[PDB]
Design a binder for this molecule. Structure first.
Ligand code: MG
Ligand code: ZN
Ligand code: ZN
Ligand code: ZN
Lengths: 112, 84, 502, 107, 171, 143, 97, 134, 49
């Protein structure tokens, strides 16, 4: 019900200004704040304090205080976030990079 | 671990991203003087060559589609439906 | 370019954060770092075997980089160490150190609570490395005695002995960079009334931490391999190489050093001082006076914006740019050099509308087209065309700026004596001008939309403005009251496809 | 279940987890005057079996970590007497699909 | 010593080679890369065994690029020298400092000092030799050496060795 | 041994200016017309007042001098101003500093020019060292 | 010009993975380091000419890799090190999931 | 003339409508760096002068200044300066690369303490173009 | 008690010159908090400006 109310509220703020945003967008935000089991805020406290990657969390607001703690807790960043691969300058695992591309010598020798 | 062809469950259709990446990759390879698997009917732009190769499904590439767990389903460009 | 290395090219899959073991800091280091002097072998023009390149990194358009050679545009720069006279707190942990002391026995190095306490075994159970340390603390902080015997896991009559030591635990509070304890005491059952008030030395905290069981510290956040709690208190100081703190040699009476090089020299000077004091007749209170100076310089170097403490200032009244402060804000290393950065193959000018452009095109001023370049690979398909743009050169519109040979070296068509008689080879790259129908990223900042950055067809046109179709105005949120727009040029066949296709 | 009017002394509350495998629940009479489950905003929660759960995780290739979580103290988690590890299947109406099934694991 | 080791090498084949002589080019490129090679981990990779059964497997197409990557699983004869290994070899070079001994793919050098005291350098000979009261060691002589230690040096492994101890020296 | 060079490689001339360019950089020879590195070093862009320092005697560092209105120094100001005032006693700190501070007081009072007024004070620091029949009086070499 | 944070976002929204990589690497920052396979540090004394590798302290003249990262990250990593933190970079995984 | 843009009578623009004068002034000092090192006003020679500007130095008279009246252009050298250090590096002032015009006036002076310093005025006439705001 | 040695003219002269120039209304090259922008360069674009 917390989710349903939270959406209702978000929806009102948009529609009050006489604007339309498709459900899904507001739904997703509402869901993300929800999933944890409570009301996880879109603040340095809420989301940024979850189990995501340390470089990711550090790219928003708490930077150095996040990397010191990352050090003493011996965190391990699995580099699945977009933030990490951007810091690292590698092709992010998003759309175009969400899959891999291989040559097949079978199909290759078939066409000639 | 790699999902068997008989147990594949991802879309039989090629994603916008897949197609954009295949066309990008082939065009890149074509441009790096890679062998072209189609009659260039006067074509000179590697993307227009790539488009042509994909149009006749003569692109020898495979999409390794990763699942959130780490497993994957491999799909041939020849076998993917291009409704885009 | 940047020369070839036989080393396997790989991608970074995991990043393993941890603290520096002083053993390791010493082991990495390529120089001792003994003197607060920059260079100047007393009024000279070479680096001093002491601070920046004692054996270290290289600068000043000169190879000398200890066998490594290479020089500037290849050398990453390698670290030196500094051996500290006495332990000092790493400003960032100071609190995690405090909390660890609060959890463990300040004499035997054993967890104040264990498997015998129910609330403990429950908090100990917590899977989350941080949440378990958090819970362990709120429990152990309160415990002010190392217990020898505790009631058995059945009867409170026959008490089972755990670890030894009966010692009373201090009430720790911080006095800015210092940790001071207040031991409960006993004296005629009462006392305190007036307790034992003493500051806990780095060395004593270090020793307790050294004695904390692997099982124990592993129950706390810590990891036996990458982050033992003993590694939070600084004993050896990694010294960053010049790349991290560049110097500039202006005109023989003007020379600019980085704030870090200043802050380091103070650390060193304060160190050299305290080392001489301990060696000589130690006057106790004149030493701890010099220690908490060293403590300050080391601390203020990593962080100068410390709450309670005075800032280290740099002659002109401005506060020293600490390391923390370089990473911190927007315009930090994170927000401003990694998560967003300025780029080449970019262009910007005043936008104006056009009823005669097609929706998807963008009017590009001739001058802008003549600057921005696309690196095209010489191929049977383009060879003749490309040779012509090369012949056309950098000044004519459909022309080119550079020729990139297989060899790696760049031919500047503007100056090369062979800019005329340039004979192309398959695989070479011609860096040619941006031309009609090239895909380009067009953008109007802010960019709170995916539609605020869209791919357009080039249309080289006269006059200094970017022309856009009027119906494309709305997504960008542009008007022609003096708005400017950004243009980015893809450099790969792949990148171009991304733009045109998505 | 122990339905109490006003309070249960901390003396009495210490006897709650004293007799396992049997389980004890405390419900303040005042909360129960109104069935929250009946509310407009409260969708159908359905408790899954050990086999049903095992299957959910198998079908979506999940670790219990990856599932959205219902908090142990949650009004509905209380109403259903959910235990840590137990999973609920939420069936909500959708303006999008008509019917949408979400799952929540207990805290 | 001299081992048969199971090994695998990843090869990145450009699309232009996706013709029927693909396996043929893969098996070939494998041999170009691996054969002759000298590593620290494995030593000298001398000869790839069982050509006819080299396992190519399925090549994954690398996404943004066209090329396919295969992990060519193979099996070969390797030579990895160790400290303490007693080897037989032929002298190659000989100087006032000692003599190098060729042991298959690698050279093992013997110091003037890592030989008995009686064996002394004779510059006044063609070619320069080491002379004992009974023995003469020169460019063609066969020697049994005890490897004292190895240095993994790029495209080779070199070693120092003694002929001072019992049952060593000329053969 | 430190050898640093930009020689084109293809047609060694030993040696000629290669251009600093205007935008492209990399110093391509007007001879082999190739490249050398990427440059990427703007010397015009020095550290302004907004960190740079122009030291004439040894090396300047600074300590303490806290005044940021965040938390009042009061107790800590005297803690650190006394602690830094103890340290300027370890290794003959006084002498050059005393000389340059007394120097800027005697010149400022007569309004001596800074550009060359400070130039002569560098000469004194070269004259205070070296031992050549100074019969030093402090005031004497100050004139 | 600055291809800033908000621009990164649009590219991420578009799914232009390779276009983004290019902007951040090829079109700006991009640099190559040699890292150690044991302690994932930039320690490696690459004498790439004589083809010598070494990570003394590891005594590793063998298990060495090369990587392409934005110089600002090479910087960031050197900075985090100077501050006693170890950002060990590994070319393989050990966790799964 | 859509979305805040406007159309101008190109005929009127020719007749002088909205034209304007433009004067930029470039300055340079001949600094004294201690007992020996002194910058100099002169036309640098490319053999004994390091890191020269790719721009042209020909418009400089031997005093290191362009005489007023000469027309200039992008990257060209208005003021020639060297900072001797040893033979000497190039510390010259080039005209902004995005501009051009004719030198209006050039004055030579000493300041409060007597450092030779020179001011150069450059005049252009800016004729209303496309992205020009009104 | 030599007068010229006693009174330092440069104190008030350059002390005012600093403020007026830079704009940090306070003493002196060690300014913060000092209020920057108190003194600024007069707009001479148009007469009205
Ligand atoms: Mg506007
Ligand atoms: Zn180096
Ligand atoms: Zn104890
Ligand atoms: Zn290592």
């Amino acid at each position: 019900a917390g989710r349903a109310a939270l959406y209702k509220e978000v929806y009102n703020v948009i529609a009050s200004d006489g604007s339309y945003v498709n459900y899904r967008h507001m739904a997703l935000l509402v869901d993300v704040m929800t999933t944890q089991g409570g009301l996880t805020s879109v603040t340095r406290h809420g989301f940024n304090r979850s189990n995501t990657g340390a470089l990711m969390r550090c790219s928003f607001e708490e930077t150095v205080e996040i990397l010191f703690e990352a050090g003493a807790s011996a965190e391990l960043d699995d580099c699945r976030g977009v933030s990490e691969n951007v810091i690292l300058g590698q092709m992010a695992p998003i759309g175009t990079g969400a899959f891999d591309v291989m040559i097949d010598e079978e199909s290759l020798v078939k066409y000639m | 671990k790699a999902i068997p062809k008989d147990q594949r469950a991802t879309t039989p259709y090629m994603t916008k991203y897949e197609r954009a990446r295949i066309l990008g990759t082939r065009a890149l390879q074509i441009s790096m003087n890679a062998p072209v698997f189609v009659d260039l009917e006067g074509e000179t732009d590697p993307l227009r060559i790539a488009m042509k190769e994909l149009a006749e499904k003569k692109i020898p590439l495979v999409i390794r589609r990763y699942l959130p767990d780490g497993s994957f389903e491999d799909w041939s460009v020849e076998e993917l439906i291009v409704d885009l | 370019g940047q020369q070839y290395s036989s080393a396997p090219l790989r991608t970074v899959k995991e990043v393993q954060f941890g603290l520096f073991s002083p053993e390791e800091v010493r082991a990495i280091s390529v120089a001792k770092i003994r003197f607060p002097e920059t260079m100047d072998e007393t009024q000279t023009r070479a680096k001093i075997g002491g601070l920046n390149d004692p054996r270290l990194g290289s600068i000043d358009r000169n190879l000398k980089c200890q066998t490594c050679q290479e020089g500037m545009n290849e050398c990453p720069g390698h670290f030196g160490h500094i051996d500290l006279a006495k332990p000092v707190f790493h400003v960032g942990f100071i609190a995690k150190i405090k909390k660890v002391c609060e959890c463990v026995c300040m004499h035997c190095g054993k967890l104040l609570l264990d498997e015998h306490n129910e609330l403990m075994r429950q908090a100990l159970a917590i899977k989350d490395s941080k949440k378990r340390f958090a819970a362990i603390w709120t429990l152990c902080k309160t415990k002010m005695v190392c217990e020898t015997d505790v009631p058995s896991e059945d009867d409170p009559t026959q008490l089972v002995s755990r670890g030894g030591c009966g010692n009373t635990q201090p009430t720790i509070r911080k006095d800015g960079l210092k940790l001071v304890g207040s031991w409960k005491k006993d004296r005629a059952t009462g006392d305190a009334d007036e307790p034992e008030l003493r500051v806990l030395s780095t060395e004593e905290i270090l020793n307790i931490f050294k004695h904390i069981s692997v099982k124990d510290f592993t129950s706390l956040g810590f990891n036996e391999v990458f982050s033992r709690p003993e590694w939070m208190i600084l004993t050896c100081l990694p010294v960053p190489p010049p790349p991290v703190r560049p110097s500039i040699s202006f005109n023989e009476s003007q020379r600019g050093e980085d704030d870090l090089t200043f802050k380091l020299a103070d650390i060193l000077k304060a160190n050299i001082s305290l080392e001489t004091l301990e060696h000589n007749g130690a006057p106790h209170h004149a030493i701890e006076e010099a220690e908490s100076l060293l403590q300050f310089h080391v601390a203020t170097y990593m962080d100068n914006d410390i709450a309670g403490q005075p800032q280290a200032l740099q002659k002109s009244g401005r506060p020293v740019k600490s390391i923390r402060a370089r990473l911190k804000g927007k315009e930090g290393r994170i927000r401003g050099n990694l998560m967003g950065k300025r780029v080449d193959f970019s262009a910007r000018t005043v936008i104006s509308g056009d009823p005669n452009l097609e929706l998807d095109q963008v009017g590009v001023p001739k001058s802008i087209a003549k600057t921005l370049t696309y690196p095209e690979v010489v191929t049977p398909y383009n060879i003749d065309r490309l040779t012509q743009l090369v012949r056309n050169g950098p000044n004519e519109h459909p022309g080119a700026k550079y020729v990139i040979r297989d060899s790696g070296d760049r031919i500047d068509l503007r100056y090369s004596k062979r800019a005329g008689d340039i004979q192309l080879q398959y695989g070479w790259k011609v860096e040619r001008h941006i031309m009609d129908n090239d895909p380009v990223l067009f953008n109007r900042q802010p960019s709170l939309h995916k539609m605020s950055m869209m791919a357009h067809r080039v249309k080289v046109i006269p006059y200094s403005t970017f022309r856009l179709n009027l119906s494309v105005t709305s997504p960008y949120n542009a008007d022609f009251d003096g708005d400017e727009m950004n243009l980015h040029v893809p450099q790969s066949e792949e990148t171009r496809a991304e733009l045109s296709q998505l | 279940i122990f339905v109490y009017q006003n309070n249960i002394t901390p003396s009495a509350m210490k006897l709650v987890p004293s007799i396992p495998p049997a389980t004890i629940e405390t419900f303040n009479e005042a909360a129960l005057v109104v069935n929250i489950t009946h509310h407009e905003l409260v969708p159908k929660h359905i408790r899954l079996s050990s086999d049903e759960k095992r299957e959910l995780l198998k079908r979506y290739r999940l670790k219990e970590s990856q599932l959205p979580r219902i908090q142990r103290a949650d009004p509905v988690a209380l109403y259903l007497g959910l235990k840590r590890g137990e999973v609920v299947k939420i069936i909500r109406k959708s303006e999008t699909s008509g019917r949408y099934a979400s799952y929540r694991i207990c805290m | 010593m001299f081992f048969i080791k199971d090994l695998s090498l990843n090869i990145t084949l450009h699309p232009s080679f996706f013709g029927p002589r693909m396996k043929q080019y893969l098996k070939t490129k494998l041999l170009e890369e691996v054969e002759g090679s000298c590593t620290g981990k494995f030593g000298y990779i001398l000869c790839v065994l069982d050509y006819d059964n080299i396992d190519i497997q399925r090549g994954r197409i690398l996404p943004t690029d066209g090329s396919a990557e295969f992990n060519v699983k193979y099996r070969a004869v390797v030579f990895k020298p160790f400290k303490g290994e007693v080897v037989d070899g032929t002298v190659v070079s000989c100087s006032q400092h000692g003599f190098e001994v060729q042991v298959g793919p690698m050279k093992v050098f013997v110091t003037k000092h890592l030989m008995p005291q009686d064996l002394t350098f004779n510059a006044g000979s063609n070619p320069p030799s080491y002379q004992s009261s009974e023995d003469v060691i020169t460019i063609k002589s066969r020697i049994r050496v005890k490897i004292e230690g190895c240095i993994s040096q790029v495209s080779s492994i070199h070693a120092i060795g003694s002929i001072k101890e019992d049952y060593l020296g000329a053969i | 041994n430190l050898n640093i060079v930009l020689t084109c490689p293809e047609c060694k001339v030993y040696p000629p200016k290669i251009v600093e360019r205007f935008s492209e950089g990399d110093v391509v020879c007007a001879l082999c017309g190739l490249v050398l590195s990427d440059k990427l070093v703007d010397t015009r862009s020095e550290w302004r007042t907004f960190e740079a320092s122009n030291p004439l005697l040894d090396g300047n560092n600074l300590s303490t001098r806290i005044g940021k209105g965040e938390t009042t120094d009061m107790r800590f100001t005297k803690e650190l101003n006394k602690a830094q005032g103890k340290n300027v006693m370890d290794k003959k700190d006084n002498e050059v500093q005393a000389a340059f501070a007394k120097i800027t007081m005697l010149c400022d009072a007569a309004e001596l020019p800074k550009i060359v007024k400070d130039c002569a004070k560098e000469a004194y620091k070269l004259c205070h060292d070296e031992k050549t029949l100074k019969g030093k009086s402090m005031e004497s070499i100050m004139a | 010009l600055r291809f800033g944070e908000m621009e990164r976002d649009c590219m991420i929204a578009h799914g232009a993975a390779s276009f983004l990589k290019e902007r951040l690497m090829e079109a700006s920052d991009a640099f190559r380091v040699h890292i150690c396979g044991i302690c994932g540090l930039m320690t490696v004394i690459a004498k790439l000419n004589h083809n010598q590798f070494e990570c003394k302290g590891c005594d590793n003249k063998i298990d060495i890799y090369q990587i392409h990262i934005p110089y600002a990250a090479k910087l960031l990593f050197q900075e985090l090190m100077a501050m006693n933190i170890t950002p060990r970079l590994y070319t393989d995984r050990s966790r799964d999931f | 003339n859509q979305e805040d843009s406007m159309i101008m009578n190109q005929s009127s623009i020719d007749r002088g409508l909205f034209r304007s004068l433009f004067f930029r002034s470039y300055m340079d000092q001949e600094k004294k760096y201690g007992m020996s090192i002194t910058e100099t006003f002169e036309k640098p020679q490319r053999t004994n002068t390091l890191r020269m500007k790719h721009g042209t130095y020909d418009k400089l008279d031997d005093d290191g200044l362009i005489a007023p009246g000469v027309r200039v252009s992008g990257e060209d050298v208005i003021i020639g300066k060297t900072t001797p250090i040893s033979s000497k590096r190039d510390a010259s002032t080039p005209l902004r690369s995005t501009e051009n015009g004719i030198v209006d006036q050039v004055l030579v002076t000493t300041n409060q303490d007597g450092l030779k310093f020179v001011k150069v005025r450059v005049r252009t006439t800016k004729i209303p173009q496309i992205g020009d705001k009104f | 008690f030599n007068m010229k040695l006693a009174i330092n003219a440069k104190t008030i002269t350059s002390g005012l010159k600093y403020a007026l120039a830079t704009g940090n209304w306070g003493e002196q090259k060690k300014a913060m908090s000092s209020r920057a922008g108190v003194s600024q360069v007069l707009n001479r674009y148009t007469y009205s400006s």
